[PDB]
Amino acid sequence: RLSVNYVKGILQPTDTCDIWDKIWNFQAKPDDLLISTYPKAGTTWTQEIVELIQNEGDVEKSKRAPTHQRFPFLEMKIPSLGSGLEQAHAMPSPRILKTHLPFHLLPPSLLEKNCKIIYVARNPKDNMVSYYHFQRMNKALPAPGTWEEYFETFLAGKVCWGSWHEHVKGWWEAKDKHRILYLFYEDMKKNPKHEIQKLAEFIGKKLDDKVLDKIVHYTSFDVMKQNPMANYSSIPAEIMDHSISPFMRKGAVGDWKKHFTVAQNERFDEDYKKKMTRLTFHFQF
Amino acid sequence: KRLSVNYVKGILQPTDTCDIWDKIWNFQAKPDDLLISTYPKAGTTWTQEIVELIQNEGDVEKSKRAPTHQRFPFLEMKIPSLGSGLEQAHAMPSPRILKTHLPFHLLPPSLLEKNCKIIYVARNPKDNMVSYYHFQRMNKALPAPGTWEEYFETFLAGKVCWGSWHEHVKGWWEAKDKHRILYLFYEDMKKNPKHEIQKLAEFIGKKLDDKVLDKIVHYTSFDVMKQNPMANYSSIPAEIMDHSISPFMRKGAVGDWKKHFTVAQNERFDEDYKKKMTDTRLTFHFQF
Numbered sequence: 001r002l003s004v005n006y007v008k009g010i011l012q013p014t015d016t017c018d019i020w021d022k023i024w025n026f027q028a029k030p031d032d033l034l035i036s037t038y039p040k041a042g043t044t045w046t047q048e049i050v051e052l053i054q055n056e057g058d059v060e061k062s063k064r065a066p067t068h069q070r071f072p073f074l075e076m077k078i079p080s081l082g083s084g085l086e087q088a089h090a091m092p093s094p095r096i097l098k099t100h101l102p103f104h105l106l107p108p109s110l111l112e113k114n115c116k117i118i119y120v121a122r123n124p125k126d127n128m129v130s131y132y133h134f135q136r137m138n139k140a141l142p143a144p145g146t147w148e149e150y151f152e153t154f155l156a157g158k159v160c161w162g163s164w165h166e167h168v169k170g171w172w173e174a175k176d177k178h179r180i181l182y183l184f185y186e187d188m189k190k191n192p193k194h195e196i197q198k199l200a201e202f203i204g205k206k207l208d209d210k211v212l213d214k215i216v217h218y219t220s221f222d223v224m225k226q227n228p229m230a231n232y233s234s235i236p237a238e239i240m241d242h243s244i245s246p247f248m249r250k251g252a253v254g255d256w257k258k259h260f261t262v263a264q265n266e267r268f269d270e271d272y273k274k275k276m277t278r279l280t281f282h283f284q285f
Numbered sequence: 286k287r288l289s290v291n292y293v294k295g296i297l298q299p300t301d302t303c304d305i306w307d308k309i310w311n312f313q314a315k316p317d318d319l320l321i322s323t324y325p326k327a328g329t330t331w332t333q334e335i336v337e338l339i340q341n342e343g344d345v346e347k348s349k350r351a352p353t354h355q356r357f358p359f360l361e362m363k364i365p366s367l368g369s370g371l372e373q374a375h376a377m378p379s380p381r382i383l384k385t386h387l388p389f390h391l392l393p394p395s396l397l398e399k400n401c402k403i404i405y406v407a408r409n410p411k412d413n414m415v416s417y418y419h420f421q422r423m424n425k426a427l428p429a430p431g432t433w434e435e436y437f438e439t440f441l442a443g444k445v446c447w448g449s450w451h452e453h454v455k456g457w458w459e460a461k462d463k464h465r466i467l468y469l470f471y472e473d474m475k476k477n478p479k480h481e482i483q484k485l486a487e488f489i490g491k492k493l494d495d496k497v498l499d500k501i502v503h504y505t506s507f508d509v510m511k512q513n514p515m516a517n518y519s520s521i522p523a524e525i526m527d528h529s530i531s532p533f534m535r536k537g538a539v540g541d542w543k544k545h546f547t548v549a550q551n552e553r554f555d556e557d558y559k560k561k562m563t564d565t566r567l568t569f570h571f572q573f
């Protein structure tokens with residue numbers, strides 16, 4: 001596995017730590033769209049939707065290259081994948097950018113330029129489960145240990161990008177005074193058309209029902225799982241082993257119930273209440 | 286090596302194919318017999334220890350004379366190298382303190398005809414399931430439990446020795462209305478041991494002073510009994526029980542099930558439980 005270290009208080013792959021100053025001083029464009037998420041909150045889904053909205057349903061164009069090549073992952077720097085920062089550097093407008101950075105670590109240019117930001121939050125228990133399996137299959141990230149160990153690791157924020165709680169909280173507090181659309185993975189799953197419409201309005205695109213319906217179809221889990229440009233199948237096998245756990249794993253809400261013991265659930269809820277707001281009303285515990 | 290299990294009168298038993306049921310059913314009780322009755326793992330060993338110390342007014346010496354299984358005849362038991370509970374009962378001087386796991390409808394009628402005092406102990410089914418799971422892992426007289434996920438469904442289905450937990454606790458709860466049964470709960474015993482000891486003493490008919498009550502509370506605590514070689518099942522042939530797999534005195538805690546059940550298992554359990562428990566007020570009693 002690739003090594004990780006602390007940069008500005010959060011675990012990151014070693015190569016990200018080494019280029020922090022470069023990341024911090026990222027140069028945004030006023031017309032950049034930023035997709036911001038805690039890892040495994042629904043980044044790939046949201047990116048696919050946002051591009052399809054921007055290109056008005058042009059499914060052929062979204063198949064031009066895989067997700068990681070289409071969308072610069074700002075803080076990412078991994079051997080065989082290059083630097084997301086430099087991917088963006090070279091890229092002409094309109095850019096659709098990705099980050100998992102907690103809000104306090106966000107390159108200030110993105111705020112200075114008042115870029116439209118889409119933040120997606122996900123139920124933390126499903127988020128833990130998704131991140132657990134991701135660490136099992138992704139060798140750029142630390143070994144997760146046993147489920148029992150990982151539960152504690154996640155709870156304490158000792159995973160890359162830090163505390164889930166701090167992450168969702170900082171971004172929620174930020175939405176009040178910045179150009180942020182704050183969405184929930186669960187709302188997207190329950191009524192994708194409604195959330196896609198909300199996205200389009202925020203992006204400033206008027207779409208008719210036909211195109212909206214088309215985006216709902218192409219961005220459904222069962223369709224995206226089969227799309228070799230959207231399912232992370234194109235990542236070198238030396239980094240992501242889909243036979244351990246596929247990137248497009250389940251795409252469901254409530255998978256956490258199959259993983260959490262009642263004891264873990266009670267400990268999680270107790271811990272949550274201590275760390276955590278109106279944000280709480282948007283999750284089902 | 287695991288011992289074969291067989292159906293006897295509709296329930297699995299850790300016993301051979303030579304049917305000796307009639308002898309058990311025709312067991313000859315005495316009016317001063319005390320009976321401790323439990324679903325497997327509901328708190329038999331604990332209750333026996335309390336009951337004898339009450340009967341002997343706190344005489345801990347007497348209770349150390351031999352281990353649990355030799356002090357207390359296990360009526361339906363017939364296991365290679367363990368002998369026969371029936372023969373052990375026949376040989377046991379009065380006043381006997383007897384043990385059974387039989388569901389109420391299979392109870393030898395002499396225990397009823399003689400109006401014997403019976404102490405039944407129920408335990409919440411989730412902790413009961415977990416306790417029985419680990420007991421089957423360690424105890425070679427019982428079936429191999431399979432995986433935890435398999436055993437969960439086996440237990441839910443009542444396909445374990447002594448049958449359905451649900452039917453067991455319900456039958457005994459209904460029985461208490463017509464027969465001389467003191468119906469106790471493991472969780473009450475754990476939460477206020479002194480209170481349940483006083484209740485038992487009054488039922489058995491012993492007027493114990495405060496010092497004796499406190500003494501029994503001390504000696505029947507999990508931590509003390511766990512270290513007591515006459516009360517912890519250490520003396521069972523190593524070929525029957527392997528305590529290195531799981532000790533008989535495992536945790537002695539209410540809510541240990543929470544470390545075993547996933548939330549999904551819990552929801553499946555709770556729905557199953559509702560469907561099986563609509564006709565009993567027992568449910569207003571179980572603590573988890």
Ligand SMILES: Nc1ncnc2c1ncn2[C@@H]1O[C@H](COP(=O)(O)O)[C@@H](OP(=O)(O)O)[C@H]1O
Nearest residue numbers: 040041042043044045130219220221249250251
């Ligand atoms: N179209 C879609 N609908 C719902 N979930 C999707 C999706 N595409 C990807 N996902 C899920 O979102 C998670 C990945 O998030 P990210 O893109 O932020 O890394 C995975 O969750 P699971 O591991 O629960 O399946 C993945 O299956």
Ligand SMILES: Nc1ncnc2c1ncn2[C@@H]1O[C@H](COP(=O)(O)O)[C@@H](OP(=O)(O)O)[C@H]1O
Nearest residue numbers: 326327328329330331416506507534535536537
């Ligand atoms: N003094 C005591 N206090 C609480 N629990 C006790 C106890 N003595 C034994 N037990 C528990 O009762 C269960 C055994 O029941 P039985 O005697 O009917 O076979 C075991 O539960 P656990 O497996 O949950 O530890 C055992 O640890």
Ligand SMILES: Oc1c(Cl)c(Cl)c(Cl)c(Cl)c1Cl
Nearest residue numbers: 039040068078100138140141
């Ligand atoms: O979201 C991602 C994270 Cl957190 C890592 Cl570490 C990697 Cl390698 C990839 Cl590809 C994605 Cl998509």
Ligand SMILES: Oc1c(Cl)c(Cl)c(Cl)c(Cl)c1Cl
Nearest residue numbers: 299325329354386424426427
């Ligand atoms: O309660 C018991 C049961 Cl059910 C069996 Cl099968 C055995 Cl072998 C023993 Cl020792 C006890 Cl205590």
Ligand SMILES: Oc1c(Cl)c(Cl)c(Cl)c(Cl)c1Cl
Nearest residue numbers: 496497498499500501503504
């Ligand atoms: O002998 C004992 C008596 Cl009588 C009491 Cl009351 C208590 Cl609490 C303890 Cl610990 C012992 Cl050892």
